[PDB]
Amino acid sequence: MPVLENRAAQGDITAPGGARRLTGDQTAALRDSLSDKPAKNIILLIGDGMGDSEITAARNYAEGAGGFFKGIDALPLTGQYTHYALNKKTGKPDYVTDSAASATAWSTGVKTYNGALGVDIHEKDHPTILEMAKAAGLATGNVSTAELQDATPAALVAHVTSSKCYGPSATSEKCPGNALEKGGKGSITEQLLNARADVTLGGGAKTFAETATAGEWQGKTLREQAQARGYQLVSDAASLNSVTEANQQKPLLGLFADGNMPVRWLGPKATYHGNIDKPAVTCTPNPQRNDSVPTLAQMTDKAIELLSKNEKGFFLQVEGASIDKQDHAANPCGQIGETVDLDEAVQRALEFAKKEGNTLVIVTADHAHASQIVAPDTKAPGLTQALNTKDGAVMVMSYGNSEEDSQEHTGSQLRIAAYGPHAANVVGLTDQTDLFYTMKAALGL
Amino acid sequence: MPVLENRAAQGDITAPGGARRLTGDQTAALRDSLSDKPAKNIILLIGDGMGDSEITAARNYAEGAGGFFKGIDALPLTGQYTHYALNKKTGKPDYVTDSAASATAWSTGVKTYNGALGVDIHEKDHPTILEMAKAAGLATGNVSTAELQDATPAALVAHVTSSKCYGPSATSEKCPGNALEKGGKGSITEQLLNARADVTLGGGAKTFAETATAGEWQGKTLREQAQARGYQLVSDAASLNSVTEANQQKPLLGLFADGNMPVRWLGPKATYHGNIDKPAVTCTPNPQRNDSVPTLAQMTDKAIELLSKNEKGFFLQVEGASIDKQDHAANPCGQIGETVDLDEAVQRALEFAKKEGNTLVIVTADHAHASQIVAPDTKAPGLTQALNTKDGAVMVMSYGNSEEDSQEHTGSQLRIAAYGPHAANVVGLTDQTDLFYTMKAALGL
Numbered sequence: 001m002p003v004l005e006n007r008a009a010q011g012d013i014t015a016p017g018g019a020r021r022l023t024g025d026q027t028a029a030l031r032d033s034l035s036d037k038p039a040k041n042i043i044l045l046i047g048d049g050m051g052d053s054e055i056t057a058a059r060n061y062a063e064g065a066g067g068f069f070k071g072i073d074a075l076p077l078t079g080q081y082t083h084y085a086l087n088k089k090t091g092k093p094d095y096v097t098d099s100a101a102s103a104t105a106w107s108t109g110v111k112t113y114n115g116a117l118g119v120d121i122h123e124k125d126h127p128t129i130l131e132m133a134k135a136a137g138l139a140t141g142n143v144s145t146a147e148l149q150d151a152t153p154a155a156l157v158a159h160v161t162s163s164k165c166y167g168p169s170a171t172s173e174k175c176p177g178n179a180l181e182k183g184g185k186g187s188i189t190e191q192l193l194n195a196r197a198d199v200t201l202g203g204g205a206k207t208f209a210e211t212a213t214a215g216e217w218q219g220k221t222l223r224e225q226a227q228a229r230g231y232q233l234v235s236d237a238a239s240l241n242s243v244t245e246a247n248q249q250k251p252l253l254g255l256f257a258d259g260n261m262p263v264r265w266l267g268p269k270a271t272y273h274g275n276i277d278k279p280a281v282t283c284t285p286n287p288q289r290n291d292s293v294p295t296l297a298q299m300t301d302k303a304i305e306l307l308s309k310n311e312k313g314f315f316l317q318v319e320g321a322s323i324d325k326q327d328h329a330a331n332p333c334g335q336i337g338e339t340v341d342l343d344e345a346v347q348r349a350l351e352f353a354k355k356e357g358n359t360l361v362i363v364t365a366d367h368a369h370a371s372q373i374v375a376p377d378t379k380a381p382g383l384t385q386a387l388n389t390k391d392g393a394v395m396v397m398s399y400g401n402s403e404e405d406s407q408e409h410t411g412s413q414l415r416i417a418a419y420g421p422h423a424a425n426v427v428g429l430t431d432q433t434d435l436f437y438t439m440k441a442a443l444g445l
Numbered sequence: 446m447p448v449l450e451n452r453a454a455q456g457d458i459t460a461p462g463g464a465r466r467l468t469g470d471q472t473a474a475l476r477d478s479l480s481d482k483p484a485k486n487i488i489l490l491i492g493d494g495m496g497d498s499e500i501t502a503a504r505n506y507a508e509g510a511g512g513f514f515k516g517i518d519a520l521p522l523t524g525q526y527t528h529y530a531l532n533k534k535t536g537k538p539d540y541v542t543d544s545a546a547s548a549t550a551w552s553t554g555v556k557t558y559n560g561a562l563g564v565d566i567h568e569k570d571h572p573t574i575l576e577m578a579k580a581a582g583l584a585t586g587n588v589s590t591a592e593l594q595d596a597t598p599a600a601l602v603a604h605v606t607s608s609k610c611y612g613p614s615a616t617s618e619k620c621p622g623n624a625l626e627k628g629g630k631g632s633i634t635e636q637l638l639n640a641r642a643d644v645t646l647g648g649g650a651k652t653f654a655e656t657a658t659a660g661e662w663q664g665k666t667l668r669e670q671a672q673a674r675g676y677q678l679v680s681d682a683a684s685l686n687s688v689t690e691a692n693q694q695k696p697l698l699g700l701f702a703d704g705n706m707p708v709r710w711l712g713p714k715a716t717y718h719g720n721i722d723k724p725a726v727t728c729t730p731n732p733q734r735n736d737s738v739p740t741l742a743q744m745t746d747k748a749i750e751l752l753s754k755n756e757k758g759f760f761l762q763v764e765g766a767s768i769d770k771q772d773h774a775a776n777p778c779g780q781i782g783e784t785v786d787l788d789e790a791v792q793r794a795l796e797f798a799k800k801e802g803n804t805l806v807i808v809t810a811d812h813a814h815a816s817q818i819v820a821p822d823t824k825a826p827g828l829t830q831a832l833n834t835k836d837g838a839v840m841v842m843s844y845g846n847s848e849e850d851s852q853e854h855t856g857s858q859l860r861i862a863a864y865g866p867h868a869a870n871v872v873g874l875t876d877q878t879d880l881f882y883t884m885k886a887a888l889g890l
């Protein structure tokens with residue numbers, strides 16, 4: 001089963017045929033990309049807020065307009081999917097999802113209301129793909145550059161009526177029906193610990209310093225609970241690297257930041273008339289990010305390594321979470337940098353999948369976002385920035401959909417791409433909830 | 446070769462699985478969708494400015510979030526393609542194309558600068574796919590809801606250094622190298638009459654009132670010239686319908702409006718804080734549109750009827766031009782109405798292609814645009830509007846990339862979809878110029 005090896009511009013983009021990404025007919029290559037044998041493993045990679053615009057902008061800057069993402073762009077089977085949520089009262093569509101309702105959709109196969117994690121509009125719990133994988137004897141992995149309590153990772157492990165229910169205090173206040181001391185299953189962090197994926201890697205160390213109000217581990221911080229329950233805790237690159245096994249006897253929990261993990265690139269925030277009155281920007285490495293903090297690729301590496309020891313197979317989710325957060329912050333360098341960071345993780349995933357040959361790799365986003373690519377001389381009403389790209393030309397980005405401090409999600413359908421067994425099920429128009437049923441059928445759960 | 450029959454939500458979108466668009470595994474159907482036999486015919490349908498956003502907004506409004514465009518969404522093979530232009534001075538990428546540069550890319554296989562038609566950055570002419578088709582004995586059709594001099598239909602039949610060169614007068618002023626009296630090939634309209642497609646249908650009667658400055662038909666209107674050269678002129682739906690043949694002896698020229706053809710739906714323009722200050726809008730049919738004006742689907746139908754008589758095959762391009770024009774105008778109803786208009790035309794194309802069996806249908810856009818779907822309570826700096834959708838819920842659209850009176854194109858990659866022989870060549874990441882080569886190779890040109 002082939003990967004797309006090189007769909008860069010093949011020539012002189014100014015000459016006839018020089019911008020072509022194809023060197024010949026694709027019918028045979030695509031025939032060869034279609035198998036309905038069982039997936040042994042799945043790797044799902046989510047660029048949070050990574051719409052087609054975010055992919056294009058990132059490619060334009062980092063690789064040139066005619067360049068090629070050896071990870072993101074390399075998956076042969078592509079479609080567009082819909083990620084609309086539901087209004088909680090009416091059950092009618094709500095055309096722009098948040099991260100919680102969208103992650104709930106691919107992870108349980110039920111649509112839900114903005115802010116819901118692993119529950120439906122009736123607040124009824126539904127099983128997640130990770131829970132099902134594990135129940136079937138599969139190894140399970142949950143990796144993110146966000147706090148692990150954030151919606152995308154949390155959706156695989158927690159069932160709560162509001163995604164703000166990070167730890168015991170939040171939960172008692174905002175999700176009283178989920179609060180442990182009220183007879184509920186507990187906060188997001190408490191539920192994550194109960195779920196006991198083999199491998200869990202991200203930020204969100206700070207919520208683990210809260211103490212439980214009830215239950216078996218009442219009166220201990222959640223970290224202590226984790227330790228008392230046999231988890232291996234690591235906090236940096238070197239300690240992650242040292243881990244040699246992860247399973248149900250010795251699950252791995254990696255906590256790499258108090259909150260979200262730091263982004264890799266620095267650049268200024270976009271500003272009003274920024275493309276006109278401020279110089280073109282070149283992104284630079286983020287000086288506030290220590291090399292000791294593992295990258296998404298490094299996290300993804302170790303996770304594959306440890307999960308792949310399972311004879312029966314694994315489920316792994318990997319989230320480039322700060323594409324979204326930097327898009328909210330109108331920061332093109334931040335956003336682009338996190339798209340590049342995700343492309344690196346996709347590369348590791350496909351290289352693994354290629355050699356093993358029974359692994360379904362999926363790359364998409366939870367919803368679209370604000371950023372747009374506009375003409376260099378645009379006079380726009382929102383925040384803009386000129387950037388010096390790999391091509392040696394200026395690209396302007398625009399953030400035009402919020403007068404408040406945060407730019408907003410958008411509701412456009414967006415790219416979903418796949419490689420490997422059952423990848424066909426991503427092609428054409430689908431819904432985010434199909435992804436659940438695709439993964440479930442692929443793994444035979 | 447199957448068409449996607451029904452990818453609407455399959456059940457109760459509030460219940461598990463109810464929002465699925467798929468009813469089972471797609472590997473078989475997709476395999477059955479892959480053929481490398483020759484395309485006898487090609488029907489290329491362009492929604493001008495119809496990015497994924499535009500598709501989604503139109504689906505949400507007209508069919509509901511979980512609805513299904515029986516034309517647009519029914520093509521089984523899907524990918525995302527890049528449409529960047531070139532800076533004429535540098536030859537480097539210009540990340541946001543106009544309609545002229547993009548149409549030149551698929552019609553010719555060469556990238557070019559914004560505003561160029563059938564010429565490269567050096568202002569050298571390159572042959573178009575329609576010209577090549579004609580050369581090989583195939584029937585040729587060129588259909589648009591725009592002025593026939595507008596960029597998209599013009600790119601098939603005209604080679605000019607500026608897309609503004611509608612007729613003799615503009616050409617002498619702005620493309621003196623192309624001016625007939627200066628020894629050039631002529632204005633866009635003169636070159637369209639030389640190209641002599643079998644079927645040409647659109648708007649743009651105005652420029653035909655001009656008289657030529659030189660050549661055999663000096664002093665005659667370009668309308669008189671068309672008639673002196675054996676063209677059959679039609680002007681409304683009944684006259685179009687009564688045409689029984691179109692060929693090189695009697696080429697068909699349909700001029701249904703003085704400028705662009707009138708749009709199908711009316712609604713108010715989006716305004717600053719429009720979603721907040723103005724009630725939700727319901728689009729209505731444009732009561733100023735005479736029913737004697739053929740719709741795009743009616744023009745498509747007649748074109749297919751006439752072109753399909755050629756035993757060797759045909760090439761037909763069909764453009765839903767006013768998606769772009771209404772997006773520029775921040776008019777959600779006009780925009781969505783034109784996307785619905787296009788979907789009707791696509792259904793005609795697919796219906797023909799399914800029975801005929803050797804016809805490749807391609808549906809895409811020239812570039813992306815401004816419109817975004819945003820949360821109903823968004824407070825945005827640009828122009829917004831709340832719409833009452835078919836779901837019985839409010840959608841808000843936003844136009845946030847220009848302070849001037851035209852909303853701007855955007856550079857995001859966007860959906861391309863195909864059905865029929867060689868439709869594989871649209872899947873994955875491609876470039877707009879690959880489409881040229883795909884069409885060329887499919888017809889053995």
Ligand SMILES: [Mg+2]
Nearest residue numbers: 048099152321
């Ligand atoms: Mg997230």
Ligand SMILES: [Mg+2]
Nearest residue numbers: 493544597766
């Ligand atoms: Mg056009």
Ligand SMILES: [Zn+2]
Nearest residue numbers: 048049099366
């Ligand atoms: Zn998100």
Ligand SMILES: [Zn+2]
Nearest residue numbers: 099324328409
């Ligand atoms: Zn967000």
Ligand SMILES: [Zn+2]
Nearest residue numbers: 493494544811
């Ligand atoms: Zn256009």
Ligand SMILES: [Zn+2]
Nearest residue numbers: 544769773854
């Ligand atoms: Zn335009």
